[PDB]
PDB file of all heavy atoms in Angstrom:
ATOM      1  N   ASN A1094       0.015  -7.276 -14.981  1.00 23.49           N
ATOM      2  CA  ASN A1094      -1.414  -7.145 -15.108  1.00 23.49           C
ATOM      3  C   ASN A1094      -1.933  -5.749 -14.642  1.00 23.49           C
ATOM      4  O   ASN A1094      -2.277  -5.614 -13.517  1.00 23.49           O
ATOM      5  CB  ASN A1094      -2.074  -8.235 -14.312  1.00 23.49           C
ATOM      6  CG  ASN A1094      -3.605  -8.167 -14.370  1.00 23.49           C
ATOM      7  OD1 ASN A1094      -4.307  -8.867 -13.596  1.00 23.49           O
ATOM      8  ND2 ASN A1094      -4.182  -7.427 -15.301  1.00 23.49           N
ATOM      9  N   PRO A1095      -2.089  -4.760 -15.616  1.00 24.38           N
ATOM     10  CA  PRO A1095      -2.637  -3.445 -15.259  1.00 24.38           C
ATOM     11  C   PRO A1095      -3.999  -3.475 -14.614  1.00 24.38           C
ATOM     12  O   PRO A1095      -4.418  -2.438 -14.122  1.00 24.38           O
ATOM     13  CB  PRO A1095      -2.682  -2.737 -16.586  1.00 24.38           C
ATOM     14  CG  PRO A1095      -1.576  -3.391 -17.388  1.00 24.38           C
ATOM     15  CD  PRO A1095      -1.740  -4.835 -17.050  1.00 24.38           C
ATOM     16  N   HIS A1096      -4.712  -4.595 -14.602  1.00 25.77           N
ATOM     17  CA  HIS A1096      -5.962  -4.699 -13.903  1.00 25.77           C
ATOM     18  C   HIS A1096      -5.840  -5.283 -12.471  1.00 25.77           C
ATOM     19  O   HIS A1096      -6.921  -5.611 -11.888  1.00 25.77           O
ATOM     20  CB  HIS A1096      -7.028  -5.495 -14.727  1.00 25.77           C
ATOM     21  CG  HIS A1096      -7.292  -4.841 -16.019  1.00 25.77           C
ATOM     22  ND1 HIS A1096      -8.112  -3.759 -16.160  1.00 25.77           N
ATOM     23  CD2 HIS A1096      -6.798  -5.065 -17.256  1.00 25.77           C
ATOM     24  CE1 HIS A1096      -8.138  -3.331 -17.401  1.00 25.77           C
ATOM     25  NE2 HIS A1096      -7.345  -4.141 -18.130  1.00 25.77           N
ATOM     26  N   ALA A1097      -4.652  -5.490 -11.978  1.00 25.84           N
ATOM     27  CA  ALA A1097      -4.499  -6.025 -10.545  1.00 25.84           C
ATOM     28  C   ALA A1097      -4.720  -4.902  -9.557  1.00 25.84           C
ATOM     29  O   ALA A1097      -4.503  -3.671  -9.880  1.00 25.84           O
ATOM     30  CB  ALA A1097      -3.098  -6.660 -10.370  1.00 25.84           C
ATOM     31  N   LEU A1098      -5.230  -5.229  -8.377  1.00 25.27           N
ATOM     32  CA  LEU A1098      -5.392  -4.275  -7.264  1.00 25.27           C
ATOM     33  C   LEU A1098      -4.474  -4.668  -6.135  1.00 25.27           C
ATOM     34  O   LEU A1098      -4.322  -5.868  -5.829  1.00 25.27           O
ATOM     35  CB  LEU A1098      -6.868  -4.272  -6.761  1.00 25.27           C
ATOM     36  CG  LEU A1098      -7.216  -3.576  -5.439  1.00 25.27           C
ATOM     37  CD1 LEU A1098      -7.035  -2.092  -5.579  1.00 25.27           C
ATOM     38  CD2 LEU A1098      -8.636  -3.939  -5.023  1.00 25.27           C
ATOM     39  N   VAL A1099      -3.834  -3.687  -5.511  1.00 19.69           N
ATOM     40  CA  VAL A1099      -3.015  -3.977  -4.333  1.00 19.69           C
ATOM     41  C   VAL A1099      -3.817  -3.571  -3.080  1.00 19.69           C
ATOM     42  O   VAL A1099      -4.326  -2.425  -3.023  1.00 19.69           O
ATOM     43  CB  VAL A1099      -1.684  -3.196  -4.310  1.00 19.69           C
ATOM     44  CG1 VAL A1099      -0.836  -3.577  -3.102  1.00 19.69           C
ATOM     45  CG2 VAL A1099      -0.904  -3.479  -5.595  1.00 19.69           C
ATOM     46  N   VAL A1100      -3.829  -4.454  -2.098  1.00 21.47           N
ATOM     47  CA  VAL A1100      -4.463  -4.157  -0.805  1.00 21.47           C
ATOM     48  C   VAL A1100      -3.438  -4.324   0.330  1.00 21.47           C
ATOM     49  O   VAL A1100      -2.569  -5.177   0.321  1.00 21.47           O
ATOM     50  CB  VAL A1100      -5.613  -5.133  -0.515  1.00 21.47           C
ATOM     51  CG1 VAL A1100      -6.218  -4.900   0.846  1.00 21.47           C
ATOM     52  CG2 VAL A1100      -6.702  -4.964  -1.589  1.00 21.47           C
ATOM     53  N   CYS A1101      -3.494  -3.419   1.309  1.00 21.44           N
ATOM     54  CA  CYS A1101      -2.576  -3.426   2.420  1.00 21.44           C
ATOM     55  C   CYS A1101      -3.402  -3.359   3.686  1.00 21.44           C
ATOM     56  O   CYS A1101      -4.253  -2.444   3.817  1.00 21.44           O
ATOM     57  CB  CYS A1101      -1.684  -2.131   2.322  1.00 21.44           C
ATOM     58  SG  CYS A1101      -0.287  -2.191   1.135  1.00 21.44           S
ATOM     59  N   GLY A1102      -3.151  -4.281   4.580  1.00 22.14           N
ATOM     60  CA  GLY A1102      -3.842  -4.349   5.892  1.00 22.14           C
ATOM     61  C   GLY A1102      -3.245  -3.404   6.890  1.00 22.14           C
ATOM     62  O   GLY A1102      -2.064  -3.195   6.957  1.00 22.14           O
ATOM     63  N   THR A1103      -4.142  -2.856   7.759  1.00 23.67           N
ATOM     64  CA  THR A1103      -3.751  -1.954   8.874  1.00 23.67           C
ATOM     65  C   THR A1103      -4.695  -2.112  10.111  1.00 23.67           C
ATOM     66  O   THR A1103      -5.924  -2.322   9.874  1.00 23.67           O
ATOM     67  CB  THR A1103      -3.822  -0.485   8.404  1.00 23.67           C
ATOM     68  OG1 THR A1103      -3.254   0.375   9.415  1.00 23.67           O
ATOM     69  CG2 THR A1103      -5.213  -0.010   8.169  1.00 23.67           C
ATOM     70  N   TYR A1104      -4.185  -1.976  11.303  1.00 25.30           N
ATOM     71  CA  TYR A1104      -5.181  -1.815  12.465  1.00 25.30           C
ATOM     72  C   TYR A1104      -4.889  -0.723  13.451  1.00 25.30           C
ATOM     73  O   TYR A1104      -5.662  -0.513  14.417  1.00 25.30           O
ATOM     74  CB  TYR A1104      -5.376  -3.165  13.244  1.00 25.30           C
ATOM     75  CG  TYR A1104      -4.170  -4.079  13.431  1.00 25.30           C
ATOM     76  CD1 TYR A1104      -2.891  -3.558  13.630  1.00 25.30           C
ATOM     77  CD2 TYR A1104      -4.345  -5.460  13.392  1.00 25.30           C
ATOM     78  CE1 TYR A1104      -1.842  -4.459  13.722  1.00 25.30           C
ATOM     79  CE2 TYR A1104      -3.302  -6.324  13.535  1.00 25.30           C
ATOM     80  CZ  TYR A1104      -2.037  -5.816  13.749  1.00 25.30           C
ATOM     81  OH  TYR A1104      -0.978  -6.686  13.884  1.00 25.30           O
ATOM     82  N   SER A1105      -3.828   0.020  13.225  1.00 24.55           N
ATOM     83  CA  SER A1105      -3.463   1.102  14.086  1.00 24.55           C
ATOM     84  C   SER A1105      -2.611   2.038  13.244  1.00 24.55           C
ATOM     85  O   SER A1105      -2.400   1.790  11.987  1.00 24.55           O
ATOM     86  CB  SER A1105      -2.642   0.575  15.273  1.00 24.55           C
ATOM     87  OG  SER A1105      -1.511  -0.209  14.907  1.00 24.55           O
ATOM     88  N   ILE A1106      -2.058   3.072  13.824  1.00 26.45           N
ATOM     89  CA  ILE A1106      -0.983   3.807  13.179  1.00 26.45           C
ATOM     90  C   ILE A1106       0.333   3.004  13.242  1.00 26.45           C
ATOM     91  O   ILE A1106       0.444   2.060  14.063  1.00 26.45           O
ATOM     92  CB  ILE A1106      -0.749   5.213  13.788  1.00 26.45           C
ATOM     93  CG1 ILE A1106      -0.332   5.141  15.219  1.00 26.45           C
ATOM     94  CG2 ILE A1106      -2.056   6.081  13.678  1.00 26.45           C
ATOM     95  CD1 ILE A1106       0.146   6.480  15.781  1.00 26.45           C
ATOM     96  N   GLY A1107       1.294   3.435  12.476  1.00 27.40           N
ATOM     97  CA  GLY A1107       2.575   2.812  12.246  1.00 27.40           C
ATOM     98  C   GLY A1107       2.570   2.031  10.941  1.00 27.40           C
ATOM     99  O   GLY A1107       1.523   1.662  10.402  1.00 27.40           O
ATOM    100  N   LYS A1108       3.800   1.838  10.405  1.00 29.27           N
ATOM    101  CA  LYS A1108       3.995   1.034   9.161  1.00 29.27           C
ATOM    102  C   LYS A1108       3.395   1.650   7.902  1.00 29.27           C
ATOM    103  O   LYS A1108       3.181   0.969   6.875  1.00 29.27           O
ATOM    104  CB  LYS A1108       3.504  -0.380   9.370  1.00 29.27           C
ATOM    105  CG  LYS A1108       4.053  -1.043  10.714  1.00 29.27           C
ATOM    106  CD  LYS A1108       3.671  -2.507  10.834  1.00 29.27           C
ATOM    107  CE  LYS A1108       4.096  -3.060  12.149  1.00 29.27           C
ATOM    108  NZ  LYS A1108       4.164  -4.553  12.122  1.00 29.27           N
ATOM    109  N   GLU A1109       3.163   2.951   7.922  1.00 32.58           N
ATOM    110  CA  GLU A1109       2.609   3.710   6.771  1.00 32.58           C
ATOM    111  C   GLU A1109       3.481   3.607   5.575  1.00 32.58           C
ATOM    112  O   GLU A1109       2.983   3.609   4.448  1.00 32.58           O
ATOM    113  CB  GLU A1109       2.412   5.143   7.190  1.00 32.58           C
ATOM    114  CG  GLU A1109       1.273   5.313   8.132  1.00 32.58           C
ATOM    115  CD  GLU A1109       1.590   5.144   9.586  1.00 32.58           C
ATOM    116  OE1 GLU A1109       2.804   4.955  10.002  1.00 32.58           O
ATOM    117  OE2 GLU A1109       0.590   5.142  10.328  1.00 32.58           O
ATOM    118  N   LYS A1110       4.791   3.568   5.769  1.00 30.79           N
ATOM    119  CA  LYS A1110       5.724   3.434   4.691  1.00 30.79           C
ATOM    120  C   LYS A1110       5.396   2.271   3.731  1.00 30.79           C
ATOM    121  O   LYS A1110       5.680   2.338   2.543  1.00 30.79           O
ATOM    122  CB  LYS A1110       7.121   3.327   5.251  1.00 30.79           C
ATOM    123  CG  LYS A1110       8.219   3.375   4.221  1.00 30.79           C
ATOM    124  CD  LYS A1110       8.278   4.711   3.495  1.00 30.79           C
ATOM    125  CE  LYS A1110       9.601   4.810   2.691  1.00 30.79           C
ATOM    126  NZ  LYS A1110       9.742   6.094   1.997  1.00 30.79           N
ATOM    127  N   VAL A1111       4.756   1.201   4.231  1.00 33.84           N
ATOM    128  CA  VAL A1111       4.402   0.046   3.399  1.00 33.84           C
ATOM    129  C   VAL A1111       3.474   0.472   2.259  1.00 33.84           C
ATOM    130  O   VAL A1111       3.735   0.297   1.049  1.00 33.84           O
ATOM    131  CB  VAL A1111       3.811  -1.104   4.149  1.00 33.84           C
ATOM    132  CG1 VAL A1111       3.362  -2.196   3.203  1.00 33.84           C
ATOM    133  CG2 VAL A1111       4.810  -1.700   5.175  1.00 33.84           C
ATOM    134  N   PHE A1112       2.381   1.064   2.610  1.00 32.88           N
ATOM    135  CA  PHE A1112       1.407   1.420   1.629  1.00 32.88           C
ATOM    136  C   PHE A1112       1.806   2.698   0.857  1.00 32.88           C
ATOM    137  O   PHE A1112       1.496   2.803  -0.321  1.00 32.88           O
ATOM    138  CB  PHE A1112       0.004   1.488   2.167  1.00 32.88           C
ATOM    139  CG  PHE A1112      -0.189   2.382   3.365  1.00 32.88           C
ATOM    140  CD1 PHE A1112      -0.434   3.724   3.222  1.00 32.88           C
ATOM    141  CD2 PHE A1112      -0.280   1.838   4.644  1.00 32.88           C
ATOM    142  CE1 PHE A1112      -0.694   4.570   4.282  1.00 32.88           C
ATOM    143  CE2 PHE A1112      -0.631   2.685   5.720  1.00 32.88           C
ATOM    144  CZ  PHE A1112      -0.818   4.033   5.548  1.00 32.88           C
ATOM    145  N   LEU A1113       2.499   3.615   1.517  1.00 33.50           N
ATOM    146  CA  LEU A1113       2.922   4.836   0.809  1.00 33.50           C
ATOM    147  C   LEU A1113       3.993   4.566  -0.290  1.00 33.50           C
ATOM    148  O   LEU A1113       3.891   5.109  -1.415  1.00 33.50           O
ATOM    149  CB  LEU A1113       3.405   5.916   1.742  1.00 33.50           C
ATOM    150  CG  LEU A1113       2.388   6.458   2.763  1.00 33.50           C
ATOM    151  CD1 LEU A1113       3.130   7.397   3.718  1.00 33.50           C
ATOM    152  CD2 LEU A1113       1.198   7.163   2.147  1.00 33.50           C
ATOM    153  N   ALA A1114       4.952   3.727   0.047  1.00 34.28           N
ATOM    154  CA  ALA A1114       5.976   3.348  -0.868  1.00 34.28           C
ATOM    155  C   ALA A1114       5.461   2.577  -2.112  1.00 34.28           C
ATOM    156  O   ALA A1114       5.889   2.856  -3.203  1.00 34.28           O
ATOM    157  CB  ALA A1114       7.035   2.554  -0.216  1.00 34.28           C
ATOM    158  N   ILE A1115       4.579   1.629  -1.892  1.00 37.62           N
ATOM    159  CA  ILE A1115       3.935   0.907  -2.952  1.00 37.62           C
ATOM    160  C   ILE A1115       3.119   1.898  -3.846  1.00 37.62           C
ATOM    161  O   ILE A1115       3.253   1.805  -5.056  1.00 37.62           O
ATOM    162  CB  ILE A1115       2.985  -0.191  -2.409  1.00 37.62           C
ATOM    163  CG1 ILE A1115       3.819  -1.348  -1.814  1.00 37.62           C
ATOM    164  CG2 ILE A1115       2.156  -0.749  -3.544  1.00 37.62           C
ATOM    165  CD1 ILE A1115       2.985  -2.341  -0.973  1.00 37.62           C
ATOM    166  N   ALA A1116       2.302   2.757  -3.239  1.00 39.44           N
ATOM    167  CA  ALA A1116       1.471   3.680  -4.035  1.00 39.44           C
ATOM    168  C   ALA A1116       2.393   4.594  -4.875  1.00 39.44           C
ATOM    169  O   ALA A1116       2.177   4.847  -6.117  1.00 39.44           O
ATOM    170  CB  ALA A1116       0.541   4.475  -3.170  1.00 39.44           C
ATOM    171  N   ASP A1117       3.471   5.058  -4.271  1.00 39.92           N
ATOM    172  CA  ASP A1117       4.367   5.952  -4.973  1.00 39.92           C
ATOM    173  C   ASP A1117       4.996   5.250  -6.248  1.00 39.92           C
ATOM    174  O   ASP A1117       5.062   5.898  -7.313  1.00 39.92           O
ATOM    175  CB  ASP A1117       5.415   6.401  -3.988  1.00 39.92           C
ATOM    176  CG  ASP A1117       6.504   7.172  -4.653  1.00 39.92           C
ATOM    177  OD1 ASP A1117       6.375   8.370  -4.891  1.00 39.92           O
ATOM    178  OD2 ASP A1117       7.550   6.549  -4.891  1.00 39.92           O
ATOM    179  N   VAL A1118       5.386   3.981  -6.144  1.00 41.44           N
ATOM    180  CA  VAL A1118       5.988   3.348  -7.303  1.00 41.44           C
ATOM    181  C   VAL A1118       4.984   3.071  -8.394  1.00 41.44           C
ATOM    182  O   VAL A1118       5.388   2.997  -9.564  1.00 41.44           O
ATOM    183  CB  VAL A1118       6.803   2.040  -6.903  1.00 41.44           C
ATOM    184  CG1 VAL A1118       5.858   0.862  -6.686  1.00 41.44           C
ATOM    185  CG2 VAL A1118       7.794   1.727  -7.949  1.00 41.44           C
ATOM    186  N   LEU A1119       3.714   2.919  -8.013  1.00 44.21           N
ATOM    187  CA  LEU A1119       2.611   2.682  -8.996  1.00 44.21           C
ATOM    188  C   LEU A1119       1.950   3.972  -9.517  1.00 44.21           C
ATOM    189  O   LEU A1119       0.971   3.872 -10.229  1.00 44.21           O
ATOM    190  CB  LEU A1119       1.535   1.795  -8.329  1.00 44.21           C
ATOM    191  CG  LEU A1119       1.998   0.397  -7.921  1.00 44.21           C
ATOM    192  CD1 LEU A1119       0.823  -0.183  -7.218  1.00 44.21           C
ATOM    193  CD2 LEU A1119       2.487  -0.446  -9.101  1.00 44.21           C
ATOM    194  N   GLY A1120       2.398   5.134  -9.091  1.00 42.00           N
ATOM    195  CA  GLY A1120       1.773   6.386  -9.468  1.00 42.00           C
ATOM    196  C   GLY A1120       0.318   6.561  -9.012  1.00 42.00           C
ATOM    197  O   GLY A1120      -0.411   7.213  -9.717  1.00 42.00           O
TER     198      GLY A1120
END
C-alpha cells in the first residue's frame, strides 16, 4: 500500500537505528 504511513515512537535518545533503517529502505 503506497499510501501507508510508518510511525516510530521515541522518548529519549537511543534506538535511532530503528527509524533510520526503515526510512532508508523506503527512500
